Design a protein around this nucleic acid. Structure first.
Lengths: 92, 322, 323, 92, 325, 313
DNA sequence: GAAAGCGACCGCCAGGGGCACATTT
DNA sequence: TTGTGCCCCTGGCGGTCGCTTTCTTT
């Protein structure tokens, strides 16, 4: 999976960007933790996100991180409290 | 990927680049939930739930069709994304429909692709009628005969089923719109939401649904899908009910209310769709390559193959399985 | 016969068997207007209203489209039902594309309409009343396509060259230069034809036609030819007229941008006030010929597309909307 | 190379778990984001740390995942306002 | 494997429940108590005698983190080593074969047979045409007494040190090596290298359970260890010597030295932090292991040679030391 | 001639060419000169200036870190120090039955005379052994001797029945599993002495895992288990009988574990005992220190040939 | 009715300030 | 001038609930 992390200040000009980035990542992936999103997607859908990022972030005072776990290195991940990684057809 | 949605009181609002669906369980009843776009490939609406008008303006820009349906699973209609611009294609699709010497040579293949799959599904499930009928199609000389032939093979397919289903249910006679039997209604379920994955594929291949090849287009129903759905009617619409009836949903469900109706209960839709994605999320190895052409792809692949068939004179080899 | 909703604040709902509209606010205690079925076979949500799914589910069980558009008329999507007779419509749309008699007798209609609106326009903007004097029937008495396209492309020249006299001095004009505009006027025209394109496109989608199969404009390069065929008989009155109107009280040289790569673009202000006229112009038309009174251009487009649907489905006549 | 996250409530009986989990992971790895550590290390270090991590949590109230990222997967962690992972010896 | 180095002689290494916290600032603020991970270390080296906590030594040794102690220059003074081994039978062999001269010979004649070839297979790389140690190598085995071999090791050390001026350059002068403190400027640097080679060699003996004080070359009659040096000897030409001319060629050519209280040409702070970098860089070089295809960093090579000698003392292995051409 | 620190409330420093032990929480500076010292023992957990940790290592002095009870955590050793001849003599002796045997006799003499003097302390009836001490000396091999300590052990343990009563049963000594309450108290004490002895060993330089009496296997710290004999009857076997008269009753023992409350009252007797002694040449002593001493006297028995007469009362 | 744009009540994150502690087969 | 917790309260993060302006664009 594509693990995304943002830790942006508590200033009322950055909270805009933090919550906006939250609303974005809620469109590409699953919320896992307060500052961790799990996006399972292809590259066509990843460029649409990186271009939406570079147009949004002030990397002189922001803090972002990304990790690229391909499928057969996610089977190894261990968890204790939260559920398992999954990207199937969704129903409700 | 694909997303099925049930509760009819679910406003499906649109936030910055996602959709929030609102559910109502009794505590104050506005419980909401985020849902990501940019990852779906199509929407399916079983009930008649709500849609924020400004959300079609999002689902119709990523290629997400909005397929409307009913509790029973009876197809009604859909909303689709930007249209196709291959008019040159829909011209050949038509000149080959008014040239019957071509239309016949196509329907022969459309059927050869169904009867072989039927007999091979029988040997796949354990049986051995349809051996000497797939060959009595190419030796025809017109179309009315071919339609009678399909009716024959279908009235043999639905009455040769008893030997494998079991004593739990009974199948004697079949009617299309009235759901007399449960299975005869589970067909209305499958036969309805297979068009969901077809009608979009045709839209991708810039094909016209109304202009028919086997079905005569003068009924008011798209005569291209109901001819294309035939090849997979016996693969995904059928093989799913026969593998969700293997220790799943045998009985204890399917309320019999409204005599003349066998509706499902809840907890059976939410499982039938899971088995559905089991079918459209598996590989069958497809002779071209050792491993290729996911099931859901196969439909879009057939549509584009027919497009080429109408512009590049390629063969149209239907999908035969063993 | 069509449940329009131009207001964005309305909501439809099924009241025990039939639709019921609530305009202009709150579901509760404000501005109800009930309306039944039995004349409804088309629902047009012009703006972006809300709708309860229980309504569509009803509609889609009897062949009732739901066309979602924008408050201006732009097309964003349509929800089409299963049972629809649009088959014969498409088959005729093609049988006319492959039978030059129908194609020709329909192209003659478009050309006749365009040049008639042009003549009636140049007298509308009373100029001298000697622009062309009689290019209309000169078409009908021909029996070919090439000899009609020559007339189109010659009337265009002999029509656009009669403009500098009518605009005056502050603006120059030599002819119609398509994208990229070498002039400001060509820019306004290529920008107004696109708004007319949105409206037509919407009409072509409701009518059920295949916009990419045409009769005059050859179908190639993915051209919505079926849209241009219907534009030809509206350009002169809605676009070529709105341009003339704004250039006598509204926009002047101050606005249009410099020659970046030569194309003359528009300002961030006019692009919002230009619609000041391009929203009222499509809110008009008290139907000069005593035929009727109630109508609108924005709606006449839907009409003409449907009249073509009938010319094909039901062998009806197709008379272009003139003046 | 390993990576660790945690999500813990604000109970005075749970805040202790956090302020001890940081005081633990410090000895076992580096630090990138608030709820996050990146810990490049060996296995027996894990059998000494995991056996301490299972040893201080109740699962009904805490959340933790463990992402395993060996060299080839670590290489691409494209970021904009942070230095990317590594682990040398240190001179002071 | 992530060694630690400290050089500010006013700091404190406190403990927080699993880890270390270093403090430097010294009252321009709140001491800048910066964190440090302890469970990932393999060793700790100190130079300025920094004040360390008492409660942290114990934890460093509960894990396997040996503590060391050097001076500002880098001279060796002492170390605090962790829990020792248990194979006292090995140590008894270390000695049982230490007082039978007929075996002590056959061992030191390998220690030196893999110490002079290791010098020549470094010179030939540096670019020395002849500098003839190849002969002393062949003349080792002929010898049949330890007093016939210590002289050869000293002679070869001097043949290897007299071939320095032409190798170094015209800048620094290395006429000879003095037993007294670093009178020679270049010689103030090997005491650093040859000083903090014991930092990595005084623990590889403690990993195989080897008794440091009982060795085969150095007479253990002066309170000086014998294995810590005898074993550190082979690696005086290739991990603590190639470091010198590796850094004296690209780096620290001059301008980073001083002199006081004896002349005593010293080094400089802010140049150590580059030297130690060079040392951790040399240690972490791979070198592919000319016996099999091990491909192991020197840092291990030492820890290995220790166990190989131990097995030689228990399992009669052949002692194949290191040589690289 | 060694510098001890029994309090973690202290600080060591090097002030103008000599040591400075700032103790009493700032309160009680007391400078000390060098060149008389040969060993330092930080018993508690003090803080120590690195400036001093050089002046002690560049000089010929180690520094042994311990805890207030005596457990061994670590030791800082210098580069130059004479422990080589010590280790060499120790090994030469392990393989020389003359020294080894005449030293094993020392340990056994100590043990049996301490047992007899314990039963004299508790005044059993004055019939425990009555002459086992010399019989050992009348032997000339090891097996003979090693067979006397077990006889003395049975004679010394079976005599506790009348000594204790019925409140606590006893017939013999059983190691892991304790099999009884008192055997478990013993194992615990017999072992807790192992820490002071482990330190006392590393303080003198000996190799614990190589010894004389207890043959070396499984890394059996033979050099410890040898020095432990002469105390097995004087500290632990005395502490147990010192608390089994007043406080510890069957309550405190599970089933045979012990409750947490007894694991802390036991030490109130252990450390307390370890803070007292008379001598015998009258010498101020605390049992803890005598262990370091016996170790140094053994090192001198191997280096200088000094006689090693063990401790008795 | 619907989107996005702000401006504050409470579940997660850490360094900092004091003041109870300290023995262990 | 040496750790290990157990408070408050000052403080840079993290997201939701509840509130005035927007809507129409080759």
């Amino acid at each position: 999976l594509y693990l995304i992390i943002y830790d942006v200040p508590a200033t009322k000009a950055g909270n805009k960007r933090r919550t906006r980035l939250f609303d974005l990542l809620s469109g590409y992936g699953k919320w896992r933790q307060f500052s961790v999103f799990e996006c399972f997607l292809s590259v066509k859908q990843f460029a649409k996100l990186q271009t939406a990022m570079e147009k949004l972030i002030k990397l002189d005072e922001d803090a972002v991180c990304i990790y690229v776990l391909d499928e057969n290195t996610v089977q190894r991940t261990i968890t204790y409290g939260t559920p398992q990684p999954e990207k199937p057809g969704s129903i409700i | 990927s694909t997303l099925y949605l049930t509760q009819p009181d679910a406003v499906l609002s649109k936030k910055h680049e996602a959709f929030h669906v609102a559910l109502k369980q009794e505590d104050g009843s506005w419980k909401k939930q985020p849902i990501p776009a940019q990852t779906l490939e199509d929407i399916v609406l079983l009930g008649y739930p709500s849609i924020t008008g400004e959300a079609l303006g999002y689902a119709l820009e990523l290629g997400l069709p909005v397929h409307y349906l009913t509790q029973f699973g009876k197809y009604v209609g859909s909303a689709l994304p930007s249209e196709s611009r291959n008019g040159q294609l829909r011209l050949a699709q038509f000149r080959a429909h008014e040239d019957p010497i071509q239309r016949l040579d196509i329907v022969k293949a459309f059927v050869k692709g169904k009867v072989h799959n039927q007999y091979n599904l029988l040997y796949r499930r354990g049986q051995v009628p349809l051996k000497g009928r797939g060959k009595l199609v190419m030796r025809q000389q017109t179309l009315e005969q071919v339609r009678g032939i399909e009716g024959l093979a279908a009235r043999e397919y639905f009455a040769s089923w008893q030997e494998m289903l079991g004593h739990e249910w009974t199948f004697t006679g079949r009617f299309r719109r009235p759901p007399t039997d449960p299975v005869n209604a589970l067909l209305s379920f499958g036969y309805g939401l297979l068009r969901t994955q077809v009608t979009a594929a045709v839209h991708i291949a810039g094909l016209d649904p109304y202009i028919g090849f086997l079905h005569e287009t003068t009924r008011g129903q798209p005569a291209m899908i109901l001819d294309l759905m035939e090849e997979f009617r016996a693969l995904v619409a059928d093989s799913v009910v026969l593998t969700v009836l293997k220790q799943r949903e045998i009985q204890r469900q399917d309320f019999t209310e409204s005599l003349g109706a066998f509706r499902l209960t809840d907890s059976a839709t939410k499982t039938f769709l899971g088995a559905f994605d089991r079918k459209l999320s598996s590989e069958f190895k497809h002779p071209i390559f050792n491993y290729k052409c996911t099931y859901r792809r196969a439909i879009e692949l057939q549509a584009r193959l027919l497009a080429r068939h109408l512009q590049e004179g390629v063969v149209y080899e239907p999908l035969v399985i063993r």
